[PDB]
Amino acid sequence: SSQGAVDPSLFPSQILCLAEQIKFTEDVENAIKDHSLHQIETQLVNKLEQYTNIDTSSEDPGNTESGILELKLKALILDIIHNIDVVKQLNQIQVHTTEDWAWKKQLRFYMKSDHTCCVQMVDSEFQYTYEYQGNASKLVYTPL
Amino acid sequence: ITYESPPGLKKNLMRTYESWTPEQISKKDNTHRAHALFSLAWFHAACQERRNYIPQGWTKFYEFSLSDLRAGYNIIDRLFDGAKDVQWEFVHGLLENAIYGGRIDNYFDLRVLQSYLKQFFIFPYSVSLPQSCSILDYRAVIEKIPEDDKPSFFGLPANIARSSQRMISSQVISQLRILGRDREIWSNELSPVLNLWKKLNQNSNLIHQKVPPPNDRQGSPILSFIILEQFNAIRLVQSVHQSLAALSKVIRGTTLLSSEVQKLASALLNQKCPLAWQSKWEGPEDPLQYLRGLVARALAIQNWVDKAEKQALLSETLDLSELFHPDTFLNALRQETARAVGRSVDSLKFVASWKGRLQEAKLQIKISGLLLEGCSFDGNQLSENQLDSPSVSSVLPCFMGWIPQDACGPYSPDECISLPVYTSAERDRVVTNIDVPCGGNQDQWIQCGAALFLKNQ
Amino acid sequence: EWDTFTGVDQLPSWIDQERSWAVATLKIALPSLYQTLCFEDAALWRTYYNNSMCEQEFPSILAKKVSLFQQILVVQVLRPDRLQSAMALFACKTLGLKEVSPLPLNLKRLYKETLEIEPILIIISPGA
Amino acid sequence: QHYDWGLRALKTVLRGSGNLLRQLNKSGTTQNANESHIVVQALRLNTM
Numbered sequence: 001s002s003q004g005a006v007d008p009s010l011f012p013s014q015i016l017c018l019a020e021q022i023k024f025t026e027d028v029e030n031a032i033k034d035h036s037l038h039q040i041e042t043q044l045v046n047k048l049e050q051y052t053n054i055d056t057s058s059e060d061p062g063n064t065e066s067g068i069l070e071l072k073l074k075a076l077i078l079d080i081i082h083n084i085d086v087v088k089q090l091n092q093i094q095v096h097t098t099e100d101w102a103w104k105k106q107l108r109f110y111m112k113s114d115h116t117c118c119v120q121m122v123d124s125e126f127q128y129t130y131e132y133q134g135n136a137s138k139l140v141y142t143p144l
Numbered sequence: 145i146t147y148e149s150p151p152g153l154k155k156n157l158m159r160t161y162e163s164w165t166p167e168q169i170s171k172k173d174n175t176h177r178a179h180a181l182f183s184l185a186w187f188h189a190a191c192q193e194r195r196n197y198i199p200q201g202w203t204k205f206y207e208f209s210l211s212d213l214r215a216g217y218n219i220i221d222r223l224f225d226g227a228k229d230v231q232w233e234f235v236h237g238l239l240e241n242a243i244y245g246g247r248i249d250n251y252f253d254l255r256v257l258q259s260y261l262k263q264f265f266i267f268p269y270s271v272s273l274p275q276s277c278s279i280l281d282y283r284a285v286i287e288k289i290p291e292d293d294k295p296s297f298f299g300l301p302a303n304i305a306r307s308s309q310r311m312i313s314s315q316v317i318s319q320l321r322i323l324g325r326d327r328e329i330w331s332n333e334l335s336p337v338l339n340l341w342k343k344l345n346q347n348s349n350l351i352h353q354k355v356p357p358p359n360d361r362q363g364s365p366i367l368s369f370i371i372l373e374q375f376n377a378i379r380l381v382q383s384v385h386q387s388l389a390a391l392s393k394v395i396r397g398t399t400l401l402s403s404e405v406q407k408l409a410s411a412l413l414n415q416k417c418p419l420a421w422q423s424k425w426e427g428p429e430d431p432l433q434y435l436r437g438l439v440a441r442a443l444a445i446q447n448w449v450d451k452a453e454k455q456a457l458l459s460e461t462l463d464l465s466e467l468f469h470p471d472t473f474l475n476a477l478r479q480e481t482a483r484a485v486g487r488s489v490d491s492l493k494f495v496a497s498w499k500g501r502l503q504e505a506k507l508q509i510k511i512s513g514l515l516l517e518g519c520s521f522d523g524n525q526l527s528e529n530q531l532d533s534p535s536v537s538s539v540l541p542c543f544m545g546w547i548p549q550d551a552c553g554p555y556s557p558d559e560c561i562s563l564p565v566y567t568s569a570e571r572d573r574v575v576t577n578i579d580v581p582c583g584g585n586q587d588q589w590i591q592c593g594a595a596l597f598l599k600n601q
Numbered sequence: 602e603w604d605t606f607t608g609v610d611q612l613p614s615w616i617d618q619e620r621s622w623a624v625a626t627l628k629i630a631l632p633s634l635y636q637t638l639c640f641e642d643a644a645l646w647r648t649y650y651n652n653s654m655c656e657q658e659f660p661s662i663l664a665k666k667v668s669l670f671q672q673i674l675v676v677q678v679l680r681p682d683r684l685q686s687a688m689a690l691f692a693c694k695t696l697g698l699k700e701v702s703p704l705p706l707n708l709k710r711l712y713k714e715t716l717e718i719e720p721i722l723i724i725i726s727p728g729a
Numbered sequence: 730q731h732y733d734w735g736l737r738a739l740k741t742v743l744r745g746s747g748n749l750l751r752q753l754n755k756s757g758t759t760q761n762a763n764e765s766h767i768v769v770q771a772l773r774l775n776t777m
Binding site: 099100101102105122123 | 222227231233234237238
Binding site: 531 | 711
């Protein structure tokens with residue numbers, strides 16, 4: 001929907017990160033079909049600025065009672081920085097369409113009509129097998 | 145049955161095209177497609193046949209399989225029977241990133257693979273007469289390829305074949321020489337080692353019998369380096385002298401054996417170097433040449449002290465043959481320039497040049513004596529080698545200093561190529577990477593595999 | 602011949618020291634070919650010393666006084682950048698083989714030859 | 730023989746900085762020079 005569903009108490013981080021990546025994927029594959037759309041890069045920059053600004057609302061209280069999940073924010077910042085770098089390189093090379101391999105090089109998280117995920121790289125695809133991970137330390141996306 | 149690679153070019157293409165089945169190649173859509181299959185065949189054959197020259201065409205012996213080739217055929221199937229207009233880019237992109245670059249650890253071999261992948265998407269044109277989708281013409285062009293192979297098909301210079309055939313001929317002659325046919329320690333299978341040592345060190349008793357004081361950091365960081373150099377050198381020299389005095393007394397004297405004496409004796413009878421000597425300093429596998437290099441550096445570092453006590457180490461022409469650890473010397477120059485300028489050490493650069501003295505640098509030192517292979521160096525231009533080109537070419541001298549970042553470099557960025565600076569012909573470890581002015585068409589200078597050696601002997 | 606083949610000078614002037622020591626070896630060992638060669642030519646051997654693919658540019662004046670094995674003795678002393686092809690054509694002439702290389706290794710060919718008395722030992726190498 | 734500068738020492742120092750900035754906002758205030766002053770202590774908790 002058009003309004004944000006920002007309510008990070010209501011969902012575990014495993015679903016927040018996945019929902020943001022799926023919606024990112026479908027929006028960018030609308031974009032490169034339609035237009036180069038620096039609007040989406042500017043939208044990601046302002047959204048990341050919003051998350052970094054809201055991060056100062058939980059950092060000063062810190063240790064409270066029945067309030068944790070500042071970690072759901074910090075596990076979202078990294079994926080947003082990944083999307084920043086992807087859109088910036090697509091801008092630097094000026095890719096025309098979707099079948100261009102500089103897009104299908106990048107990792108894609110589609111949605112199937114049976115509503116379950118299907119992680120799909122270049123041509124190989126797999127399925128999301130719904131293991132509940134909980135909070136864990138993710139990695140910085142180096143080009144290695 | 146020995147199950148290996150074919151020993152030649154057109155042999156490899158014949159094995160490849162025998163392993164294909166013709167219903168695979170004979171598709172309806174014909175003309176632009178099977179020529180790419182021939183490009184894959186030539187690329188597989190070339191990358192396999194580079195391995196005969198080591199460390200020239202590759203730095204190690206990388207394992208390339210036929211499963212790699214069949215995977216590549218699967219790729220080109222899903223490309224051409226994929227929809228329209230296959231991008232030549234991502235063929236080599238996925239190919240480097242998954243298949244053939246998944247054997248590679250050094251960066252410069254990746255560069256060489258990048259150059260062949262860029263090149264082969266055109267041929268030595270006179271030897272290449274390609275055809276239409278007729279399969280037996282693809283068979284017959286292989287017989288139109290000559291028997292004997294040429295490195296001009298590959299990119300290597302012509303002195304490669306001279307050195308290779310000299311060494312291979314001596315190998316086969318010694319191997320056919322094989323088909324025709326404690327006392328040794330008391331004999332003289334190891335006497336010329338001791339004899340070369342007694343010639344190296346008979347008039348340098350100060351140079352193996354003096355003691356430098358154990359020192360800490362002085363004022364400028366170039367003094368401490370040379371003092372530690374002196375200390376390590378005299379320590380290794382006296383250690384070698386003890387390890388040879390023991391094995392001298394067990395032969396030409398009256399004593400008995402230990403186990404480490406047997407270790408030194410076993411390694412020196414097999415004419416390799418013991419692990420205790422390689423624990424300190426890496427040298428040549430010849431122990432004789434090892435003692436040579438060691439005593440040479442032993443003379444040298446005392447001369448370095450004598451001309452660096454007065455801070456006159458800026459003016460004189462010096463040579464990097466005589467440094468046990470030259471990059472630590474260059475990083476000592478990094479500290480002295482970063483202290484003399486008044487800027488933090490992380491914000492400098494290292495550029496050398498040939499077309500005159502460094503302007504924007506703090507210090508200028510004349511470094512000469514480098515050796516070069518794979519090309520023929522001239523000021524402002526690299527020239528290709530010839531048939532009668534000698535192997536080891538000396539070089540014009542250089543000016544080296546440390547330059548602050550975001551300043552104007554003496555060479556423009558898109559006219560030069562980075563070359564490793566190894567230590568000897570074995571091509572083991574990298575000191576730095578200097579830029580050399582190319583002037584366009586850099587891919588030839590990639591596929592030559594140009595290098596630069598700090599010295600020899 | 603075979604022992605000095607497998608290793609078991611102020612008169613020449615246009616050559617290198619590296620070949621001159623082997624010249625001294627050939628002169629002390631086999632003075633017969635030293636007499637028959639006339640090394641002070643500097644006319645035909647100047648031509649032979651400068652050809653590429655110099656296995657077949659033999660001076661044809663001496664083409665009936667020198668055997669096939671003595672040409673390789675000439676090659677080893679003059680120019681060791683030729684010995685592999687020299688041996689190759691020596692063997693190809695003495696045995697009539699059109700190549701020193703073998704055929705490839707199609708296992709579909711060597712299926713039908715074998716038989717169940719003895720098995721088939723496939724030696725491998727790295728990457729095989 | 731026994732030194733190290735791998736990825737693990739770096740990953741240690743980064744959490745050693747994250748913990749100090751985790752203390753010095755809920756326990757006080759934030760300013761300029763302390764933010765670059767922290768990383769020296771968060772590096773010398775290992776490297777010393």
